[PDB]
Short mmCIF file of C-alpha atoms and ligand atoms in Angstrom, two decimals:
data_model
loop_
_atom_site.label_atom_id
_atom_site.label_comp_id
_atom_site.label_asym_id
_atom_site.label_seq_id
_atom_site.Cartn_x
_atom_site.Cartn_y
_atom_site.Cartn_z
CA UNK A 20 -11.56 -20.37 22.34
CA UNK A 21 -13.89 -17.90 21.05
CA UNK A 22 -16.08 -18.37 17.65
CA UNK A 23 -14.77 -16.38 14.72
CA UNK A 24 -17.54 -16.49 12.05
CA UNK A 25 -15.18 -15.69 9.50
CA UNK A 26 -15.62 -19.24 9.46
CA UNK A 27 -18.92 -20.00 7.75
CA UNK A 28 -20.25 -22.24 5.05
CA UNK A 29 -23.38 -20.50 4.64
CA UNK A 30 -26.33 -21.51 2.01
CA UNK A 31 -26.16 -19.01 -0.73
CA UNK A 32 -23.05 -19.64 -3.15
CA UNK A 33 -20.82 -16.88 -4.04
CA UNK A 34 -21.43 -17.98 -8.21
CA UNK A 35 -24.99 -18.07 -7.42
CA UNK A 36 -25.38 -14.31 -6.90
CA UNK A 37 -22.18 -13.23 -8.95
CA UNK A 38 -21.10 -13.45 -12.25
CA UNK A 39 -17.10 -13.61 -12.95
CA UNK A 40 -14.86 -12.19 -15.81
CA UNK A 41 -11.97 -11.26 -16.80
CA UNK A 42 -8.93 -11.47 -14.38
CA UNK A 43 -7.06 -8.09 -12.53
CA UNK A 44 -3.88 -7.46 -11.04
CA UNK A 45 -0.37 -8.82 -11.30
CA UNK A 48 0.54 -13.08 -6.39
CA UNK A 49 -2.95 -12.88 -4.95
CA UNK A 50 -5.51 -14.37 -7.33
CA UNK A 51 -8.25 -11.78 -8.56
CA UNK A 52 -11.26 -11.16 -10.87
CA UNK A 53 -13.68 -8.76 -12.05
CA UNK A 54 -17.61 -9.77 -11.05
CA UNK A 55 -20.92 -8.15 -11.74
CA UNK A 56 -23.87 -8.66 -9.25
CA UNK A 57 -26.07 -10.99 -10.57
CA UNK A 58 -28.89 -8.56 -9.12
CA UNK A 59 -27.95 -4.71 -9.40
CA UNK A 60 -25.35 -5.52 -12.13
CA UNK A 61 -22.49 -3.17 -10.64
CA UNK A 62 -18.64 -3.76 -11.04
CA UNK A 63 -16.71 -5.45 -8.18
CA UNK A 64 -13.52 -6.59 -7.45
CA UNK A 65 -13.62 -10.33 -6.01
CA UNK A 66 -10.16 -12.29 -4.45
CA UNK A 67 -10.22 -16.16 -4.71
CA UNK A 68 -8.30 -17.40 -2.13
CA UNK A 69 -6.98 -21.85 -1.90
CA UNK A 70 -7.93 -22.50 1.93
CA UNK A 71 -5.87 -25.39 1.39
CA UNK A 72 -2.66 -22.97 0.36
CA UNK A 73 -3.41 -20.21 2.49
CA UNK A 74 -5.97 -19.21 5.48
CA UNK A 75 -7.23 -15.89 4.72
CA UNK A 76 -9.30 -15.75 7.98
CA UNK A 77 -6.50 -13.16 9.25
CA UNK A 78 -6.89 -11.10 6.39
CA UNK A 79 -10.85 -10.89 6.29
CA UNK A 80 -11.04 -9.46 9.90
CA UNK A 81 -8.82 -6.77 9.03
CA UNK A 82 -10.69 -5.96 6.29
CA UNK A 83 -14.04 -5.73 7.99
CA UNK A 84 -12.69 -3.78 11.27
CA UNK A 85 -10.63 -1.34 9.50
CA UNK A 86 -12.62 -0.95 6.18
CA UNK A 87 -15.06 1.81 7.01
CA UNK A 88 -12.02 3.79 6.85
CA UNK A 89 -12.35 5.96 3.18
CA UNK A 90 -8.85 5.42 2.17
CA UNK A 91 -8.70 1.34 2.54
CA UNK A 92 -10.36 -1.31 -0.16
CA UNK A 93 -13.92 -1.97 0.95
CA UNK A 94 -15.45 -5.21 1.88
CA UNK A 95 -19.00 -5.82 0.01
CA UNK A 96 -19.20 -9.27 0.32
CA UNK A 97 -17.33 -12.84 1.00
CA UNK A 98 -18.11 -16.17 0.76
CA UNK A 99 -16.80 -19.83 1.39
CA UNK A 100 -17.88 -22.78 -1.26
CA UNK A 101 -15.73 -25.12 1.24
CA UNK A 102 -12.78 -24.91 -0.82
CA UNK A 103 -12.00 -21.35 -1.55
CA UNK A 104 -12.72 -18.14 0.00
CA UNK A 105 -14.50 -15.20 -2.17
CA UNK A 106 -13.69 -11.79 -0.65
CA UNK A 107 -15.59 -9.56 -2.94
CA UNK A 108 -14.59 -5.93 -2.59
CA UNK A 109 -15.05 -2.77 -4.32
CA UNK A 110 -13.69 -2.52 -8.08
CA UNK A 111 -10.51 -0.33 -8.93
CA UNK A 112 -11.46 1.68 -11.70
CA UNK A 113 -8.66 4.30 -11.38
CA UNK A 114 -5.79 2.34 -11.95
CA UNK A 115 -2.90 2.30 -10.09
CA UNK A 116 -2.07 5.66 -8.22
CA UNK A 117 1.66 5.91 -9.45
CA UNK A 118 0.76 4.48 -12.60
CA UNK A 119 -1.27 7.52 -13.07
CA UNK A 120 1.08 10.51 -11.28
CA UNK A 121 4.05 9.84 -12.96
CA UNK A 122 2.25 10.57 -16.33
CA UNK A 123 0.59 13.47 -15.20
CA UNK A 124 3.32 15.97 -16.57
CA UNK A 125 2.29 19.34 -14.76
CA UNK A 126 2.76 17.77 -11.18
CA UNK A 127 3.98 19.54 -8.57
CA UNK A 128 5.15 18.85 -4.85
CA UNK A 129 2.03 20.89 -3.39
CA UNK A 130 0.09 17.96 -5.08
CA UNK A 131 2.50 15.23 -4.30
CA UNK A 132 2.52 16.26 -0.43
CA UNK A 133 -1.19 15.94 -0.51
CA UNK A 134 -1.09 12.34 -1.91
CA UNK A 135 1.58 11.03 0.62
CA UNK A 136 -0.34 13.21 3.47
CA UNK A 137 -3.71 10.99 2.68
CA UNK A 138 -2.03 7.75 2.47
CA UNK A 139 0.14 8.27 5.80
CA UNK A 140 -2.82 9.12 7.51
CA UNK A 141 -4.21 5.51 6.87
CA UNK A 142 -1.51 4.12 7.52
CA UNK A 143 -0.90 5.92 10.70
CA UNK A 144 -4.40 4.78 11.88
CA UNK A 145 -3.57 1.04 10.95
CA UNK A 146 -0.23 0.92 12.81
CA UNK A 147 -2.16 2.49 16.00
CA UNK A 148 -4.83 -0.51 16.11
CA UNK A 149 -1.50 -2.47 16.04
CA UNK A 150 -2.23 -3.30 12.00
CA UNK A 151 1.12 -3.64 9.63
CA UNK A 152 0.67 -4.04 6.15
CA UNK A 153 4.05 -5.66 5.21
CA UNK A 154 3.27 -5.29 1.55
CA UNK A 155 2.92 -1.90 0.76
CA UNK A 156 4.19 -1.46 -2.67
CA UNK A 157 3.18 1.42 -5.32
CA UNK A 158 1.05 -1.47 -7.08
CA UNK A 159 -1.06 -1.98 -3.93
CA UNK A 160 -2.49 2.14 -3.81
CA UNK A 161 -4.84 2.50 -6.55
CA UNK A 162 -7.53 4.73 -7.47
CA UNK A 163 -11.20 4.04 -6.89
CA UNK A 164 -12.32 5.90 -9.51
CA UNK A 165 -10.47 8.88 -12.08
CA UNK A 166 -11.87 11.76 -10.43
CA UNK A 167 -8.25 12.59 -9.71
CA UNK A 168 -8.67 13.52 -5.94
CA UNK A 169 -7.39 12.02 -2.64
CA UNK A 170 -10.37 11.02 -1.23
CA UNK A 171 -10.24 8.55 -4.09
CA UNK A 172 -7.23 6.44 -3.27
CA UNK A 173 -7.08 3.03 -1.87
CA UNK A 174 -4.72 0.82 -0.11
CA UNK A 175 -5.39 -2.93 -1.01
CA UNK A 176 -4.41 -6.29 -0.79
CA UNK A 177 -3.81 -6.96 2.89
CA UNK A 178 -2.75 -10.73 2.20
CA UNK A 179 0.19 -10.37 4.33
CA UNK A 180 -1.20 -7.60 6.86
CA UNK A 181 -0.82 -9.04 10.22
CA UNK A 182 -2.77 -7.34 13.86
CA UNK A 183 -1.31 -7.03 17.09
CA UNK A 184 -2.10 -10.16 19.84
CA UNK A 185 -0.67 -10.99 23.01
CA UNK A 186 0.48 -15.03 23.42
CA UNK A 187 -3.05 -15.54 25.02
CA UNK A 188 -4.66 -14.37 22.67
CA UNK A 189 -5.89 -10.73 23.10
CA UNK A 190 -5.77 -7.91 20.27
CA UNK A 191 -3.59 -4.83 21.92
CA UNK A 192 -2.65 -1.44 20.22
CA UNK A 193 1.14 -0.73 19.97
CA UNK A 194 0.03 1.89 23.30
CA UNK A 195 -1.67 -0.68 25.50
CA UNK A 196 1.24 -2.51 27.51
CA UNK A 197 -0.23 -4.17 30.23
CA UNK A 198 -1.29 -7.30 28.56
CA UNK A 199 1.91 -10.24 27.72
CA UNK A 200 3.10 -10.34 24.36
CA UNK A 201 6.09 -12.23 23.19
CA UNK A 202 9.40 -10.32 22.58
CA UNK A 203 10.23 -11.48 19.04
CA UNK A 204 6.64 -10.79 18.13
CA UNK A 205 6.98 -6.43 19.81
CA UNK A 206 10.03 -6.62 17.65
CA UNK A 207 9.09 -8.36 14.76
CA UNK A 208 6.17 -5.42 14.94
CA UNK A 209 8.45 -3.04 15.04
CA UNK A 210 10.13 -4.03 11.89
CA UNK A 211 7.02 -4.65 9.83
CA UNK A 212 5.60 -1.10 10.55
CA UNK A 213 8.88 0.61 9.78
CA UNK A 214 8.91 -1.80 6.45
CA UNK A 215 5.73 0.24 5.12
CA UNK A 216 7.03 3.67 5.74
CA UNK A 217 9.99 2.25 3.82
CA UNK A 218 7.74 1.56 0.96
CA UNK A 219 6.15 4.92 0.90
CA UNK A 220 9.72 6.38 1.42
CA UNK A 221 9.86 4.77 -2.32
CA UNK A 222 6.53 5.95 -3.41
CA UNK A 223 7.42 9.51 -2.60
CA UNK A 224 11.03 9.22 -4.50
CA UNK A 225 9.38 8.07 -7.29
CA UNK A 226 6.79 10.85 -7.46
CA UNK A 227 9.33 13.45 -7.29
CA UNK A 228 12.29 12.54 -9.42
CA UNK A 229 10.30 9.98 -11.89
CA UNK A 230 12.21 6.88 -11.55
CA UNK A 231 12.77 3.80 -8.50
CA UNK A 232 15.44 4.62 -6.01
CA UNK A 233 17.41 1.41 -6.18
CA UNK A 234 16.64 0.14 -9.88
CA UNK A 235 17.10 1.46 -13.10
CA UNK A 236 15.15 -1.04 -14.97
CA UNK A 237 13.59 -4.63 -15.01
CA UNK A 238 16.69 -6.02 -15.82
CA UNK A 239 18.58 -5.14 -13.01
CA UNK A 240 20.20 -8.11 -11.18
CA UNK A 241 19.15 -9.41 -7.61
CA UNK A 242 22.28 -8.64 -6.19
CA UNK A 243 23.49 -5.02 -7.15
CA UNK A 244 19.75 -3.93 -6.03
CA UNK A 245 20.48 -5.50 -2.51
CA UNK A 246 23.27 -4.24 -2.79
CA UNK A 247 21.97 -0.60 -2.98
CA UNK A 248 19.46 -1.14 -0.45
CA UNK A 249 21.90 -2.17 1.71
CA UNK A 250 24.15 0.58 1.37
CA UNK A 251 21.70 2.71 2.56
CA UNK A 252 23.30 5.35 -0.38
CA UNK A 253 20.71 7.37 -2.51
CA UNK A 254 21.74 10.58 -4.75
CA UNK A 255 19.60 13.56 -3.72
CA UNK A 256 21.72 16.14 -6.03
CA UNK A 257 21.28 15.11 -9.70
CA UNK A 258 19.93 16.89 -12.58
CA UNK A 259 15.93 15.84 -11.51
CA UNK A 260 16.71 16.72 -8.52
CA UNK A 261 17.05 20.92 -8.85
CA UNK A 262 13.73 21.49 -9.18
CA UNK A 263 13.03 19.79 -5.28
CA UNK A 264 13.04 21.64 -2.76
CA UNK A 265 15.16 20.48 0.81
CA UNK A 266 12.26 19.64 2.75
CA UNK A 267 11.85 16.95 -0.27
CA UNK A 268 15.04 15.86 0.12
CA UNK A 269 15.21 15.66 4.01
CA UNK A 270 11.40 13.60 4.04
CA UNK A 271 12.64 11.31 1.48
CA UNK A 272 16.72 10.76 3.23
CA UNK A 273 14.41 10.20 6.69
CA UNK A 274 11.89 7.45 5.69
CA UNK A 275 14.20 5.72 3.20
CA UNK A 276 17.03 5.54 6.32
CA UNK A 277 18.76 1.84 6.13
CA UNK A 278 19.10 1.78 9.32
CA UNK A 279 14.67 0.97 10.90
CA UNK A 280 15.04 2.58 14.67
CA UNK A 281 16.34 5.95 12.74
CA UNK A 282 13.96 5.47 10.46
CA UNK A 283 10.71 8.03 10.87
CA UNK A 284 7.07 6.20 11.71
CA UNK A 285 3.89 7.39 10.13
CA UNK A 286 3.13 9.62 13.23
CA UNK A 287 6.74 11.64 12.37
CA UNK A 288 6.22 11.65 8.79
CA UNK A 289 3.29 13.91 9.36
CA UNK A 290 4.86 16.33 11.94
CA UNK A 291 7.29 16.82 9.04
CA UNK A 292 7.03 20.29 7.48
CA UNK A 293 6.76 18.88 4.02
CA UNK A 294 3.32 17.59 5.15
CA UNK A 295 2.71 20.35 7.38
CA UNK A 296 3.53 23.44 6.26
CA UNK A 297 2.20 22.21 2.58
CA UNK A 298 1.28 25.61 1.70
CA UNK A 299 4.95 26.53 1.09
CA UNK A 300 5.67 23.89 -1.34
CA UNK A 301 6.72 24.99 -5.00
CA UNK A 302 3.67 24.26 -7.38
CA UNK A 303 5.63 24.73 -10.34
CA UNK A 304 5.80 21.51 -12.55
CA UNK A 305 8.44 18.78 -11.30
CA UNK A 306 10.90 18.11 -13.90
CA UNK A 307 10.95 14.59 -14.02
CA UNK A 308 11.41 11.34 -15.89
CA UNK A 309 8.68 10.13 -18.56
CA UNK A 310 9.00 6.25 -18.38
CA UNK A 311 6.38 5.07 -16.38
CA UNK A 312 6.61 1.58 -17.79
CA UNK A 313 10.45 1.22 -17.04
CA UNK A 314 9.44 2.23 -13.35
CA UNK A 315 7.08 -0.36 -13.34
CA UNK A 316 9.51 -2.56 -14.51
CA UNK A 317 12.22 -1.16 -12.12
CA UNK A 318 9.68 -1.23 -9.37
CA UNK A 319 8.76 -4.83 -9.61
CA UNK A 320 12.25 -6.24 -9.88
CA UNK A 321 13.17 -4.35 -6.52
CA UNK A 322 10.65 -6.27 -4.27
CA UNK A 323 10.94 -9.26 -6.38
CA UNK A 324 14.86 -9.26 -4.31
CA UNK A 325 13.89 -8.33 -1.55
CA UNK A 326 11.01 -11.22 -1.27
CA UNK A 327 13.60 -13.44 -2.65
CA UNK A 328 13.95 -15.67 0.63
C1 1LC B 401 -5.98 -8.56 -6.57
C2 1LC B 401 -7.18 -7.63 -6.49
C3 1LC B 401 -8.22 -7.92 -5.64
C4 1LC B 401 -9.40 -7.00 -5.56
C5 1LC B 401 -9.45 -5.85 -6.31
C6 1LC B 401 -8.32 -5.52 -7.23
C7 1LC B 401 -8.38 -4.25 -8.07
O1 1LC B 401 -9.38 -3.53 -8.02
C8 1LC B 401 -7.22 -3.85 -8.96
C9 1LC B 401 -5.86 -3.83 -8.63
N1 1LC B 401 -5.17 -3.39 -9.75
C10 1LC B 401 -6.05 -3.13 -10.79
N2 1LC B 401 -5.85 -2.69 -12.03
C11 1LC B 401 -6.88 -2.51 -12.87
C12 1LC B 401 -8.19 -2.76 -12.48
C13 1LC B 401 -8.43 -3.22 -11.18
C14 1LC B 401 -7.35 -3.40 -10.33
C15 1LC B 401 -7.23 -6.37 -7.31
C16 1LC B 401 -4.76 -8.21 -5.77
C17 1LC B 401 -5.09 -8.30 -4.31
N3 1LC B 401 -5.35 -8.38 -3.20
C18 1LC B 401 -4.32 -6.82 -6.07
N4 1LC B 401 -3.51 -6.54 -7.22
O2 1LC B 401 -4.66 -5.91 -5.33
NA1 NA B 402 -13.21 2.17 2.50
#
């Protein structure tokens, strides 16, 4: 029964310093503020207490957001009501958004972007962190300067840590304490769930379109039913120009079945991410329909969060 002071009704109001505008994003409620004092851009999350208790989310975001690749906290307040967590701005769009119009990209370039995101969320998974919501619209820029260093893994409305029954925060390595079965396995699941998502990511870098949708339009059922199969062509016309390695990464983290299924650690012993150096640079023939992938994209996790 320890104090959390997530929990705080402070003095100073969260309108009283900040200054709101228009909205941003696409199920999370969100707005771009300016500082009342230094006038700078941020990006600020209104959360209904009442709906939702963002506590959980808060803490992750203030242990784990030092780390250069994940969505800074600035600032967060608590009128009673809602919850303000006011975090840094997204200037750079979204990351795929971005990529896929990019027409001279190659896999050298592509393995660098995967390598950087990984390497969060290999980090996160070891301080028994899942994200379990780690779709292309969630990486974004920070700013256009084009690099790595610049991306950003946000929203973590649905990220859930590690905790024995009693209590107690444990990494995925520290055993000794008693967690609940369910709860190791439903861990399990979750973490293999992201690398799943980036297993998308990655297709859609390469070849220019979603793995299990076509379009927007796409009915619930046949893209279950492709993402059940487990089925995914790796020999069609965009796909000459990619080499094996490619093709082998993207088979391995995409694999239906999650115990077969590669973790974050494996992904980066894989010589797509190691030996990097190798990798073709030569422009990936690709797909130009970055809006029908957006389309395609949203309609695929709109089945699978269906229940
Ligand atoms: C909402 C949310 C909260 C905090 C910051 C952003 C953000 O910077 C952002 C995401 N997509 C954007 N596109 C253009 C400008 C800024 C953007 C967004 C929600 C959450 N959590 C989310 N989409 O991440
Ligand atoms: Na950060």
């Amino acid at each position: 029964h320890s104090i959390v002071q997530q929990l705080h009704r402070n003095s100073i109001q969260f309108t009283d310093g900040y200054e709101v505008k228009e909205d941003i994003g696409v199920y999370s409620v969100c707005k771009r503020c300016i500082h009342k004092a230094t006038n700078m851009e941020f990006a600020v999350k209104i959360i209904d207490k009442s709906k939702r208790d963002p506590t959980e989310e808060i803490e992750i975001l203030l242990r784990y957001g030092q780390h250069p690749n994940i969505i800074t906290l600035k600032d967060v307040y608590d009128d009673g009501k809602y919850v303000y967590v006011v975090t840094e701005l997204m200037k750079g769009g979204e990351l795929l958004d971005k990529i896929l119009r990019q027409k001279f990209f190659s896999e050298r370039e592509a393995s660098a972007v995967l390598f950087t995101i990984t390497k969060t969320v290999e980090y996160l998974h070891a301080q028994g962190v899942v994200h379990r919501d780690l779709k292309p619209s969630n990486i974004l820029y920070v700013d256009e300067s084009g690099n790595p260093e610049s991306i950003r893994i946000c929203d973590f409305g649905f990220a859930k840590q590690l905790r024995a029954e009693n209590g107690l925060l444990m990494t995925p390595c520290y055993t000794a304490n008693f967690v609940a079965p369910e709860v190791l396995e439903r861990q399990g699941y979750d973490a293999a769930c992201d690398i799943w998502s980036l297993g998308v990511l990655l297709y859609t870098m390469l070849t220019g379109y979603t793995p299990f949708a076509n379009g927007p339009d796409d009915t619930p059922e046949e893209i279950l039913a492709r993402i059940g199969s487990g089925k995914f062509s790796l020999s069609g016309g965009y796909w000459n120009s990619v080499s094996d390695t490619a093709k082998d990464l993207v088979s391995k983290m995409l694999h239906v079945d999650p115990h077969q299924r590669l973790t974050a650690a494996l992904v980066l012993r894989h010589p797509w991410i190691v030996h990097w150096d190798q990798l073709p640079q030569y422009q990936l023939n690709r797909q130009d329909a970055p809006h029908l992938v957006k389309g395609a994209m949203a309609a695929t996790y709109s089945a699978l969060n269906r229940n």
